[model samples]
Target: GRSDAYTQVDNFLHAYARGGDELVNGHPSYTVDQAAEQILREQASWQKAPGDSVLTLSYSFLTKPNDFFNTPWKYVSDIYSLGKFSAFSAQQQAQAKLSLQSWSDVTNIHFVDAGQGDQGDLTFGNFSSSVGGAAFAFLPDVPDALKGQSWYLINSSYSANVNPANGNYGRQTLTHEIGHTLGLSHPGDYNAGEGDPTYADATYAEDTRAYSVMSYWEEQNTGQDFKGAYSSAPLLDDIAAIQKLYGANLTTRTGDTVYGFNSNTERDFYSATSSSSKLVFSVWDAGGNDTLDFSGFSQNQKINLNEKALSDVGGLKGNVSIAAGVTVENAIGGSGSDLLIGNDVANVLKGGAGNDILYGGLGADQLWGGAGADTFVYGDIAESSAAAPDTLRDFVSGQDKIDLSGLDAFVNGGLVLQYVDAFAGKAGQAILSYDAASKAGSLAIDFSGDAHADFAINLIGQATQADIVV
Candidate 1:
């Protein structure tokens, strides 16, 4: 019933990083109250996102704020002479636009380029001196300013920070600064050089760069290090915080979308070009059947498709995830030992190759453990009852096992799994019957301790005594 290739390290067979029920539980779940307290602006009276509803926002680079806009004396001494944000290489400006779009993608916020003569609602320029950090932006509702009309300053290091090609730090910096431009604040009440800040002072456990870019802390603050690999998109807590201030952008990606390999979403951060490429993003699909396709990789990964749950993708802990209320129905794992867990809806979960384990929780699922000795786990009979059974598309009898260790065989008896040649008239007996012509079989179990079988698992191939596990 077991195989040589199926180890916990290779397959994530247990819990936590080891692969079990813990990853399905996700990284210490957080509520909107905590998210709001940490990432949302501290002031309750300040307006958020520059407006009360979904509307266009005016932003500028070359033009200093007119009388209608607010520009502080300390930040405006250089006086709007082809600001660094606009004067830099097109790549940095493009990254800035992408970062702005990332914020708009999750909430009812939108950004529009300001006309040369238009008064700036949100103005951008470079810092006169090293304000000591990368960049700084005035909080929204700074007296005369509109909600987002507050001034933005790009520190001198930012030119080099966003200058890198192929790396996300540039985009990440833009996204983080833009987050401040919107109504969000740092997860903790600390600054970049304000002494050594640790996760101990964080508002919540998920208050790291892994979940929100507003955090100066890294993912190591929570657990593993993404090695400063920041997400190009708004992360889990950022989405919730922004949506809490502004409503969710129900119109964005409300159609069928796919992330990772074979992506149709068109969003660059959503697609990973190769195994050598790192993935650090939280999914936010408004509606329709979506998929997390990591099939191009050959590393052992754990992919969870449940909303607000995290998965270990590309060998990074809690690297890939789904946001709250977003329903993603499919997951295609890498061509290595993987643990693929599905949700309540009917799912198409495919474990490409190597030894894999798939758990289709509470759904009529199609599970395929392509080319390795695999395990099909059904924790409860209701998960694969004959009425809406999970079909194991490829099961080599002697190589794979149908694990029943989590489920009990009898309702009243102490018996768990009693494999017998035939169910004479006993409750806890499980028998496998195969037909010669069809090459198909069923493993029937008598849960009532009566003569009849309660439920039967329909299989594509033969299931002999060697394939059943108690």
Candidate 2:
């Protein structure tokens, strides 16, 4: 029964205002701002008092004097409806579902429907002064006209013939009122023309983006909403507010930072700066082992380990542009979107996560695009997997691109640009290409993936032999 009648209110308030207000006074026009301020003002004694609060509920028996003795079951039905609305909002329900698996812990409040002798003024939800609890006592004199018509506010005589075929009314009304009881006011207060002027007790509203369940409107449903022909789930804001009140324990951080046990490793962070401070790490010892643990590094950290022997390495975290030269073992490991230039020797490169830009610059390098869309590059010729290599990783275009080109040269003497999933020819992808006659080279890229894309050639001879004999 709780699931049948009250849950609709749960869905309505949550979907619209998010578990914030409830309808009272049957007319469905009572402003939640007035209710919250009134409750807080009246229950001043429980402001910061101790002891858990208890909220009580009583029903309008809908029967004659002492008739409840003869028809105990009819009174019981009224009590059930009374208890349904007073317990908690849908957001609270969600959290209770997670932590307190017991149904009783999730729904612990009590409800009663007494005979006519004790039938008193039906009071809406109220916060108590003494026991720090709230009591809602209903009266038998509730309008007979209300039996079929749904009262928006709790215990109000005014009713509307809400089409249950369209949606259940009891749950919708109760959830809205619960929003009022939980201290949220109406959201439409900010709209100049939408709200009433009589009860302007500090409540305000903004546009739809700023409105919540506390705001008044036909859209305010705590659990769900019937949009067009379908029932939509509650808005995220409604759930957020309920959690804010009853369950406030959710937070997430966005920036990059080293966390957990292994936070002591030195981090090498890099940013592209006119090609001046390119993060480069080089090791040049035969059969020696070098390990650069990048696992602890945060975002935007670049690393270049040159000529180092092979060992377990720390994987790169963020974006990396690397020119892997000859004799370089496993240039990268673990993962990330990286630009790897496998210059010479039998290089092993792996591209992890994200769309990677891979270049098998020279030699027979094993290149792998772990995941994501990737672009690979290849040179004039391919070298044997057994041949030793040289540093031929070159920028080869802009003054700086050509200046740092030798960083990838290897011992092969011949230039070999081999890229995995080689785009072969992409604008800016192949900035430089090596030629045979006079050992000159040119650059070619096809933007259209069709014929006669973009091609340019420049005869820059072997970088002028580096003047090593000088």
Candidate 3:
């Protein structure tokens, strides 16, 4: 049998995209379906993939037609001339390029500045209009003369100044505008102050900037917001939409990547240098055994490494996520009562310092609970079968516990470990055996009540009966 390249877009289409009609998290996913229709409707898209591995696009800066660059003067779109096109200041250009880099980083499209006398596939210009300002962009399907141009009113905040970091509103707006130039539309029909606007008016519930940069609303519109910082990078839904058009960029960060505090990915969207700086982005590593190392925050974070899953991180709710098709193999949680979960793949989970809970779901995993009353859990016997059992790297007796309450209890009654020196051939019994000579042990359970143990967990140090919770 031949193999097709597997991508997160597959998972997205089956689950979140749902052919653009199914309600993901209880709303029609306009981010997917609507995005498709919009791109198709506007004819604002590149050719379909199934061909060249990477698609390259060009961009240009306009400082007004026939200005110093002698770029030639022509009416664009028959709607307006490149009206008083002024070039961006160096700071503004830097921020704009930063925004472009982010888009290129996450998708198969590579954006380069159109050098020489070319008109560019995408164009950025500041115009001397909209003293009552708003940013606008032309779709790729527009008249050849008008396609790939975005204009901002010279006096607007986005055109005038580079916003500071951590939810930089100006940068966020620029990203949103750039998103439009790349063919993404707003997830809703109405603008932010179009009448008494509300999130309920959104075609889908996940219509905030947290989900898509194309959105004009705030995170509170979705009923989950802790005033988390804005995302300068394209958020979850934005990535889905852009990648849907251009295909997933499989060449980005192909090496071992780390995100959050002390991140080596070098993308601003993935790292938090200070505790005061909150992080909100979906992971998009194309390769490597990646990790979500959110070990700097003191807040109790629930970080899920599963694709398309949400995470409550760095003091915010539903503020983080794993993109579809990306497998992050490890997680290092922070100091609060964190719940760290792994995916189907083998994982290395570290609960830094708290009464943390770690679940290495359906894999031969290595679990570490650092400096707290921790719990290493396995709800199903198959999660830790004898052939590939999970291992607790640091099992501190009398403090940490091995929780296996999801299976049939080792006892006929409530959830509690029934310790035995041996499995007395009883159907409901748990026996923890340790070989001192090797300084290792195994927690075995006879759920079938036969003489044989059906489930076993390899333990790295000795653990007493007080350490088991069934």
Candidate 4:
């Protein structure tokens, strides 16, 4: 197409080849195609096609003069916006292929660049937007054989086009409209026109949940229609629609079907046959007779207790390795102490009520003790790095009793602790007067180890003081 006309096919191939065989210091690097293809192949067991049936296919181009990838923003804008809703106006292409080894099913796809499509092929005339973009698609209702095939077109012109310099058109706008061409409707439109807080309210009386990229229009006067870059993956609904239309070979079972759903109506067990299975959650609707049979399930299977009926199971004994996201809210009845053992990943252990004990394991975590005296254990050395030979130790108790003996590596290496207001006189600021070599542990203020000076006041007002005393 456009690339072919400009003899840029070599550059395009070079870009792809370099992207595929990238390396650092002559060592091979992991590529995205390898990862995606491997996953797609592993997932083909449930499909009826051959393993490589979807591997190879040829693509044709209708636009030879457009170098879409050269200046993607301008190329996409002109092809999608100026070209409008026409069959010949689309910017990208791919072909369907069949597997020759096993099942000869046509499951392969090969994409063509419309800009590269028009290259040396004289069959396609100049490939310009001069012709109405709407007149090109194969409309079955129009009684034309060419109109029967599905076509996607981009349209750039609109009333909003004012300044040519600003190029006011959002990059995501073309893709979003292209998504519509691919039969994807706005997800927010599913439950609009009501008091749903998720819906945008243009009225001034209430807070408006302004339109997102999926909305009919961009937020008021923002000029940008959608947020996020164009390269981002499609939403779940968009993925579902694409798979449904093209018949994706996804692997799934009766129980595993609802594995990742936000809500589950039935109790199901999932077993880990491979190492990839780690602490995954199960969403089960609470009921009296609800039972989770984890006899075949993998380790660290967290059960989310979202319903009231599933609060406690009497017969379920032993530490079954379940996790729950429970909110400790404050009330007028007075606050109470709560102990929280986080399951997996770094959870936000908030002490909203009374004194709380929060234990964050191996993950780098954050803890907030709001209006309460909270004891937060930074690391769980025992349960965290279970079998690892490298286990961290040497913890100092109080802010003043800290001796940098075991932590000499940090101090001798010239690492310094910068403190802020909240950490003043607390965990971070105590290091100012800390003597790395001393084990005597008594707080003292002296120019040369004197007994008359006040140490506590000097330590407390370290922020106001100039430099550390020798």
Candidate 5:
């Protein structure tokens, strides 16, 4: 699944937009190799966001050095010198120019006229017969042996009317096809058949169908557009898509250090305005579900996801993941079923009334599985350090189970479960402990398996061997 080309493309675009290092002549600069490395690094470091869509757009062109111009050029000029245009006149050419200008207006991509000879990054011409689907253009990266080079062709029989009021489709067709030359695929291309492109990111999915000029015309007719098939210029989604490949027109920074999501919608941290290390996120309870994504955060900072104060803000009501280097001071879930994850730090995870899942990644964590049946996970079992051991408080035997499948001690036969009539130092309290060749730790009990046994639980009120699930 990770090798999927479409998914790779999606990540490529997202990283290309966010991780460029230098700017030359006001345009972001990156080699094809650099772009590939960034994409791979991002994929390995973070998990996919909740609602990422499948990439269905089509791009006949590629950015492999010899394929298309990989770096942002000083200018991208075109020529329209060779085609016979008796029916398609000067007015039609002017209309087409407007469409090209639309792309230049939003990105660092600048297009100019190459004048007389057949010299330009893109060439425009006319064909004798009407090609099916209004008109079509060749994508970039055509081999040197190809006769026409990289260009767009319009049929002589095609009518060019600027005014949509005249019932004629003007420069929109050329505009749409030219977009393909710039490495943009159709947003709904995969939707024509089964297993269409869909998004886990709510914003991307909503914008693709509602505001993209690159979407199929038939798919665009969702009772929203009154003018049938007509878009004089690129839409907002078109600008965003193109700007990702080229550099964006604006700076990528935000003023809001704090964010609050009160609805069932999904939030993306990379798209947020603030890249602040000191960040605060609050998810309020508003009846629907909510997801907080921290994958975009790439720094060591403090975070808080608390639903403990129930008056104004309701429960988390969903799932949460703490980024690799992030240090979460508090992560409290709500009354609904939830999933909580921690990084390699000693995190404090407290679940509410609903059945929950907790993962203490690499550090000795303090976990509490609130009301319903919950799961506590420990990934490393080779850790024999008596200094730091996970302490789980409300681990109900019948309702909760300890997950040790990821532990090498459990899988490799290095550990065994046993019930102790009296823990090493607790004197009169019974407890459950995991015994290894040189170390032991307690589960579902208030016992610190330190060298001196600083704390121990009475098994009379704690969990037994039946509670452990490997």
Candidate 6:
């Protein structure tokens, strides 16, 4: 009855054939063992054709009426010795085990050694020198006769040397062959080394460019050293392919973190926080025109904008608004034009380079326009306190402008200006003195010529009457 029976070959062909096409060598068969041999021979002669980019998974090769392993977990028996393969030493066996472990590292799939027996899901063997070819393996969902069988033959025939110069081609070859057993096909199965086929698909275009172990071009060292080979490990594309079948590993993030763009482009940073446990935070920008938007943060916080620590940034590149009652310990800008702002508390704003604008709110603050035409704005029109007199550094005669739009009551409400003969033991300083029933405040300035000053403009260098604006 066994000889005359028509053995169901659907599962065997479904795992090996490309679509409904005839098996390699056109060997139509009834028994599973014969089908395995035919598929192996076909795989040996198969080559990637030009202009094809389809990467078929072992699971995808199946048609209707088939059963595949529900879980990625599987057991592999220790390599069985056959003839010339018996000479393989323990070191060689360990090296082979390392190849299997590489696949288990990135995906949810797991492979365990079942020891020498026919009980394992897959078994390994070797052949004589005359067999030709490096190595090969069988896909799953096959007959028990060849379900877990693989082989490496003719050890000396490989042309690629195994060294740093050649990128350990031998070890990588073993990993590539093992991938076949794990249900992965060559990414170059359709279009070899010409161009990436994955490029056609927008979802995985980037992965294809990342290079994959399941590609023919990967087996050869193309001057990329070991990095181009699958021997080092699967690339991003390879990991994506396997994880698609076996799922992905868990990712964990802990502790306070600060990250943003640091390039020469435009970006926005919303908020930063120091860890409650460590009370420390770090930030990095990749040399881009960027912004730190703290308008949402209502708490009092100190920020150090130092040049040595933060690089490649036009400090405060865009319009920035800080919450009320916030203090800026140090604010520095880049060579590009920048705008810096402060809240109601005492703030320190510095423009490192380029034409910059500094706004000092209700609180007394220190502002420095490092270079280029700059502007300093004060919104506090109330009486000046000895503790909160705003200090301006590097106030140029014709290049910088002082804005006192907030002092509407003093400027328009009949305020008088008088020249102060001495200020802080210095002569030739002008003071804008205001004393009314509703408001009382004085602004001091250093001017070379006589001019009515409603506000005091502190001067670091030579200043003239034309420099002061009411």
Deviation (Å) of 351 in candidate 6: 25
Q: Which candidate is the best by lDDT?
A: 3
Listing every candidate in turn, what is its Cα RMSD in Å to the true structure after a full C-alpha superposition?
Answer: 5.2, 23.6, 7.1, 24.3, 17.5, 23.9
User: What are the TM-scores, per candidate, against the unseen true structure?
Assistant: 0.83, 0.24, 0.83, 0.26, 0.33, 0.33
Candidate order by TM-score, highest to lowest?
3, 1, 5, 6, 4, 2
**Tens digits of lDDT, candidate 3, 137-211:** 755665666667666666443443333344666677678888877777776663344656666677666777666
Whole-model lDDT, model 6: 0.40
Better of 3 and 6 by TM-score: 3
- Native-vs-model 2 lDDT? 0.29
- Provide the lDDT at 141 for model 6: 47
Write out the backbone clash pairs for model 1. Answer: 14-19, 14-20, 121-149, 427-449
Clashes of each: 4, 62, 4, 32, 12, 16
Q: Mind giving the per-residue lDDT tens digits that candidate 1 earns over 200-268?
A: 656456677777888777776566556556788888888888888778889888788889988997778
Give the Cα error of residue 456 in candidate 6, in Å: 29
* Model 2 stretches with alpha carbons more than 4 Å out: 1-171, 188-211, 218-234, 249-470
Task: Give model 4's TM-score versus the native structure.
Answer: 0.26
User: Candidates' lDDT values, in order?
Assistant: 0.69, 0.29, 0.71, 0.26, 0.41, 0.40
**Best-to-worst ranking by lDDT:** 3, 1, 5, 6, 2, 4
Residue 431, candidate 3: alpha-carbon lDDT:
77
Please give the TM-score that candidate 5 achieves against the real structure. Answer: 0.33
